[PDB]
Design a protein around this ligand. Structure first.
Ligand SMILES: N#Cc1ccn2c(-c3ccncc3)c(-c3ccc(F)cc3)nc2c1
Ligand SMILES: [Cl-]
Length: 306
């Protein structure tokens, strides 16, 4: 019996994540494709249970796939949500590992809106990376809308009934991708809303420069590696990262880096700050992205790009 979840047939294997087993599926009642995620029950890291509850909490919001099923088939935990298109990292490589100024802007306002809606539901993401932001699929109304997925690192920062922020703390091991995590994350501080925004800043400069100065650093093990990445993050100001770039990015990273621990960040001020970038360059925020031009204008291909 290959079909799982009563109504979801296993299709292609696309599994990535942190070796988390991800599969293509389709709903045999209506043929709609889905993204099936596997997980061993008797494992050393149970997480798929709470990720199922996370999508339900953010259900109905734009950019969050709908949770359809969580079951106990065989010796695997199974979560069915919406299948989506490639990640921003996938399109990044295909666009020559560099994004134009127009694309990174319109992308940044969508990511900031997604992260705002996450914090609106009393959750922080803590796993900001372009591998977790996906576009829709071809032909759909949200084909180029940027979506957010993978909430296995989502932690509550305020209670839903007294809206009080958790207390500040320290001594937390450095878990995640060190290339984009905030400076406070390297220092072992308890993450909050401001750390999901500094990591967004790192991704913006990452898309702009094609790389980051704290990339490819050599160290014996990973602690010193994670440390050695933190030094360069604090050595280089935000202006030197904005070299030859619209200075509004330097302002964005500097602002979100001086935010206090429990403060609500001015989401719409940052998005408008990034909107004004298109004013100084004479461009219209119409939607046109870099990846709408590969392969003679067809879009993105599978056997040539990936
Ligand atoms: N790096 C990387 C990466 C890229 C894509 N995904 C997906 C995904 C999401 C929607 N459609 C297709 C694939 C998932 C995922 C998460 C939960 C779930 F229940 C099903 C799939 N996890 C990852 C990791
Ligand atoms: Cl790296």
């Amino acid at each position: 019996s290959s079909v799982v979840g009563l109504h979801y047939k296993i299709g292609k294997k696309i599994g990535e994540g942190s070796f988390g087993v991800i599969f293509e599926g389709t709903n045999i009642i209506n043929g709609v494709p889905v993204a099936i995620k596997f997980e061993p029950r008797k494992t050393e890291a149970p997480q798929l249970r709470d990720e199922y509850r996370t999508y339900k909490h953010l259900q109905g919001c734009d950019g969050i796939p709908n949770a359809y099923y969580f079951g106990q088939e065989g010796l695997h935990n199974i979560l069915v949500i919406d299948l989506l298109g490639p990640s921003l990292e996938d399109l990044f490589d295909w666009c020559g590992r560099r994004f134009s100024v127009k694309t990174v802007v319109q992308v940044a306002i969508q990511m900031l809106t997604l992260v705002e809606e996450v914090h609106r539901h009393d959750l922080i993401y803590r796993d900001i990376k372009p591998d977790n932001f996906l576009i829709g699929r071809r032909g759909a109304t949200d084909e180029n809308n940027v979506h957010l997925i993978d909430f296995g690192m989502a932690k509550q920062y305020r209670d839903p009934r007294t809206k009080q922020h958790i207390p500040y703390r320290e001594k937390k091991s450095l878990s995640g991708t060190a290339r984009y995590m905030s400076i406070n994350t390297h220092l072992g501080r308890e993450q909050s809303r401001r750390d999901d925004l500094e990591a967004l800043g790192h991704v913006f400069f990452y898309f702009l420069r094609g790389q980051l100065p704290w990339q490819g650093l050599k160290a014996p093990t990973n602690k010193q590696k994670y440390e050695k990445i933190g030094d360069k993050k604090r050595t280089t100001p935000a202006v030197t990262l904005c070299d030859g770039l619209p200075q509004q990015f330097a302002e964005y990273l500097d602002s979100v880096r001086s935010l206090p621990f429990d403060a609500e960040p001015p989401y719409e001020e940052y998005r408008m700050l990034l909107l004004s970038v298109l004013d100084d360059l004479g461009q219209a925020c119409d939607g046109d992205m870099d990846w709408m031009h590969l392969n003679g204008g067809r879009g993105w291909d599978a056997t040539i790009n990936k």
